Design a protein around this ligand. Sequence first.
Ligand SMILES: Nc1ncnc2c1ncn2[C@@H]1O[C@H](COP(=O)(O)OP(=O)(O)OP(=O)(O)O)[C@@H](O)[C@H]1O
Ligand SMILES: [Mg+2]
Ligand SMILES: [Mg+2]
Ligand SMILES: [Zn+2]
Length: 351
Amino acid sequence: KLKKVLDKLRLKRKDISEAAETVNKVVERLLRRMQKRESEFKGVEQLNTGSYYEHVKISAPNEFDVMFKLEVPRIELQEYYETGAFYLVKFKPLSHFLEGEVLSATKMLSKFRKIIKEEVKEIKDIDVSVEKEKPGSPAVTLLIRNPEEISVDIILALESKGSWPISTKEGLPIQGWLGTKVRTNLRREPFYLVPKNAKDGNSFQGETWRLSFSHTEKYILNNHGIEKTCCESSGAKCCRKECLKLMKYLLEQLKKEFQELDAFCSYHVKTAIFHMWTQDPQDSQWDPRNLSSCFDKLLAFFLECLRTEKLDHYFIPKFNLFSQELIDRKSKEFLSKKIEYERNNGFPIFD
DNA sequence: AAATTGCCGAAGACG
DNA sequence: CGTCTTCGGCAATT
Ligand SMILES: Nc1ncnc2c1ncn2[C@@H]1O[C@H](COP(=O)(O)OP(=O)(O)OP(=O)(O)O)[C@@H](O)[C@H]1O
Ligand SMILES: [Mg+2]
Ligand SMILES: [Mg+2]
Ligand SMILES: [Zn+2]
């Protein structure tokens, strides 16, 4: 039954090919423009992130996330209040994005958006436009007709090679699952900041940046087993990724018909299952034969997070994604009832 | 330093 | 299942 649903959610190679060919052409062209002399962004490198590249995109290859990352050496961080996630950036070029001593996310991003705008109107062979700007959002979204509709979020990110901000010190609790060498290695990789503004201190503090761990999350998806051979050709398949797909599908459907579930996103589901993977590390607990019950354990845990109004950011424990701020209580109760109904009625929404 | 290429894992297709 | 193919990611290469 859930196996029936997964077959339906499974992407088609023909769709993958047509979408990727077009996506790749457009991004390569944008990345190249960014390298032109006397651009502030002359060092950016591409990093493919998110659902599609983690092989957990469902239904159709119609949304792509791409990070353009800029190495900005010698940066001082000041935590914005007590969030753990949001920061103000100072320096120890790009000398016109300033606001006193503060590197403005808004200025750096607006200029980033402007250059993408000009390049896109130069594109004649492909139907592509730039989506209306979303306040506080860090992405410049391309809208593509191939003729099928595809979205590409291009995300400017500052790369810093120093050790991670202390708010992350108790995060990434993978010691009993992926282990201590993996955790230590992952934390010597750089950290990233994206120009997503903090909505606190009404409304958006235009200078604020947000921590991003898209790279770390990507590695974990591709190295998710307690055993090194999990999902390899000389190893055993697990159902970790397929549980994630089923939970994303559920939310995605619920969001489709209830506007009151805006402000929930797939990241909430992704965060909830990373916690689950930590709680249940053994690969044997994620055997394909036990798919139904793993999904049920995920659901019960997600409800428990919903009911207690707490979902700890996997990398930043201080940061509650389900605080009273960010998401209203009633919105959580609403989602609790919908889930509880679909759970007790064999998931009719799956059709 | 910018493109080209070789390598192979993850996973879709198919029987 | 086993086998075949494509896409993505890496970095040596010139
Ligand atoms: N609210 C958030 N907090 C922290 N990181 C986020 C948040 N939203 C998105 N991200 C990062 O950006 C990436 C892309 O976000 P997006 O909303 O496209 O979801 P996704 O993981 O690609 O899943 P899907 O595209 O299938 O909804 C995520 O994988 C995540 O790492
Ligand atoms: Mg996405
Ligand atoms: Mg996105
Ligand atoms: Zn696995």
